[PDB]
């Protein structure tokens, strides 16, 4: 399957005193591997997965230099956009950026991203051709013009198709024991009476990676979509994910209902019955 490297940056202005709070996190697929937090003491990019500790001291110095430079760029952008939106100095605002790349099953570049939000709304995004920009509003047209005139898409494309893919491949190999392992969900059903005449069946999917999964209920082999309660996929805290789906049914009729679990770690979907 494909794999992804992504960085997620959040900078929030502090109008009462001081410079913006900046947090950067890096992921390979659904695994966080580095962080930086401007409020922390180290002022360093820090490891958050064991396989990134394979990198030498030069890696940590370089990523710290680059992440601190990114923090300054977000501080500048918060100031600039406050002006573009004619906002006062009294309010807190947020600039978010995400960028990164995917490789295919063929181990080659598949796609790149580089996009921004202001106050939680799309602002400007590099299009899929990595050669042009999408501006969400008229403020962002200013940035789009500036970036077209500066021809900055070329250097972004160079990073996204080149350097980004090269380092993603390195990380995948270094981290292969986890990054290239799928953890199929451990599945089971629980049964709870809610009265003498009805019961809840809850289908659990536990300890799975990556996070993408589908859980669905059927009754007599046809979907039972409207009567399903489904919680959002949630982190276990140990790097794996959890989900459940439940249906209330007449007690004595449990055997009509099946839970269907689809996940990349399962060569065929699983069917569970009480």
């Amino acid at each position: 399957g494909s794999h992804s490297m992504r960085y997620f940056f959040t900078s929030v202005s502090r109008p009462g005193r001081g410079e913006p709070r900046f947090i950067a996190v890096g992921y390979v697929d659904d695994t966080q591997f580095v962080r930086f937090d401007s409020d922390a003491a180290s002022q360093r990019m820090e490891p958050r997965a064991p396989w990134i500790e394979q990198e030498g001291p030069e890696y940590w110095d370089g990523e710290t230099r680059k992440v601190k430079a990114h923090s300054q760029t977000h501080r500048v952008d918060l100031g600039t956009l406050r002006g573009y939106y004619n906002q006062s100095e009294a309010g807190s605002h947020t600039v978010q950026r995400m960028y990164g790349c995917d490789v295919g099953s063929d181990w080659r570049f598949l796609r790149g991203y580089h996009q921004y939000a202001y106050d939680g709304k799309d602002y400007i995004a590099l299009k899929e051709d990595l050669r042009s920009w999408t501006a969400a509003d008229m403020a962002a047209q200013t940035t789009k013009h500036k970036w077209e005139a500066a021809h900055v898409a070329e250097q972004l494309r160079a990073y996204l198709e080149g350097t980004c893919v090269e380092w993603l491949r390195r990380y995948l190999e270094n981290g292969k024991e986890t990054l290239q392992r799928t953890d199929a969900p451990k599945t089971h059903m629980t049964h709870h009476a809610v009265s003498d005449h009805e019961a809840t069946l809850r289908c659990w999917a536990l300890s799975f990676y990556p996070a993408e999964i589908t859980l669905t209920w059927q009754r007599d082999g046809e979907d039972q979509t409207q009567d399903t309660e489904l919680v959002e996929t949630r982190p276990a805290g140990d790097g794996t994910f959890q989900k459940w789906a439940a249906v209330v049914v007449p007690s004595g009729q449990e055997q009509r209902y099946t839970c269907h679990v689809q996940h990349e770690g399962l060569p065929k979907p699983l069917t569970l019955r009480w």
Binding site: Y7, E63, K66, Y116, L156, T163, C164
Partner: peptide
Amino acid sequence: FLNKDLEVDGHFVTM
């Protein structure tokens, strides 16, 4: 591995 900031002719280019 992070990218460098947008730079042209020795000078960084922000929004």
